[PDB]
């Protein structure tokens, strides 16, 4: 729909990873012993999942509301301050590992 290359923002987190944890979370009590590396990875993904899902839902909501705003150009001039503060927060966050 657009000739230009859109630099869409995503989250470096595959939603499927938690599924793997659930497999472990089911297979651990099933009697099957999994390698310790898999245990550590699944546990870390499980404990870190809420933050990742919060980030992805927040960024999706922001993208939807910002495209709604730019749909009506008469309001971006007023909403510029909130857009600036959100962009500043995103800029602060992105540098983090």
């Amino acid at each position: 729909g657009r000739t230009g290359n859109v630099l869409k923002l995503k989250v470096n987190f595959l939603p499927e990873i938690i599924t793997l944890s659930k497999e472990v979370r089911n297979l651990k009590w099933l009697g099957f012993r999994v390698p310790l590396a898999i245990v550590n990875k699944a546990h870390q993904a499980n404990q870190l999942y809420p933050f990742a899902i919060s980030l992805i839902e927040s960024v999706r909501t922001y993208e939807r509301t910002c495209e709604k705003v730019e749909e009506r150009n008469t309001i971006s001039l007023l909403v510029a301050g909130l857009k600036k503060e959100v962009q500043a927060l995103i800029a602060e966050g992105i540098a983090l590992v």
């Binding site: 001039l77 007023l78 909403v79 510029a80 301050g81 909130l82």
Partner: protein, 157 residues
């Protein structure tokens, strides 16, 4: 109706102001520019309708001819009818022109710039003014020869 619309718009603007949003004054300025452009267009339409009415409710101006000490006289004079017509057209103008501005002096209190905001330029005003010395001119012309009859008294038997 125009005043009520402006009051509601200003109330909405004040409601936005109290919420402490960002970048209000420039948005207010652009909105005021657009509303004054629309006001100028509507004023042009109303003024041209008033003009074609002359050639919109218009009051009926009337003056009489009488005689005193055997002299023909006017009550009120034709220039008085001219001034009444100008006053009525002025009132028609301030119907729209007296609308207050939108804000977060006299000119700033209520909007007086629509004449410069005229979509068709001063012509729409001028033609209106023009119709004036249509009417009054014919009036005095129609008076003049008639008034001439007073000369009959100036010429004794």
């Amino acid at each position: 109706t125009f005043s009520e619309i402006l009051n509601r718009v200003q109330k909405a603007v004040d409601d936005l102001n109290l919420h402490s949003y960002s970048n209000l004054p420039i948005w207010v300025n652009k909105l005021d520019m657009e509303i004054e452009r629309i006001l100028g267009v509507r004023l042009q339409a109303g003024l041209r309708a008033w003009t074609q009415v002359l050639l919109p409710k218009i009051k009926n101006v009337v003056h009489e001819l009488r005689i005193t000490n055997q002299v023909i006289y006017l009550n009120p004079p034709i220039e008085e009818c001219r001034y009444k017509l100008y006053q009525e057209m002025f009132a028609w103008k301030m119907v729209v022109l007296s609308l207050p501005r939108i804000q977060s002096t006299e000119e700033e209190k209520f909007y007086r710039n629509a004449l410069t905001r005229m979509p068709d330029g001063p012509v729409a005003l001028e033609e209106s003014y023009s119709a004036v010395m249509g009417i009054v001119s014919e009036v005095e012309q129609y008076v003049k020869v008639w008034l001439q009859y007073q000369c009959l008294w100036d010429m004794q038997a």
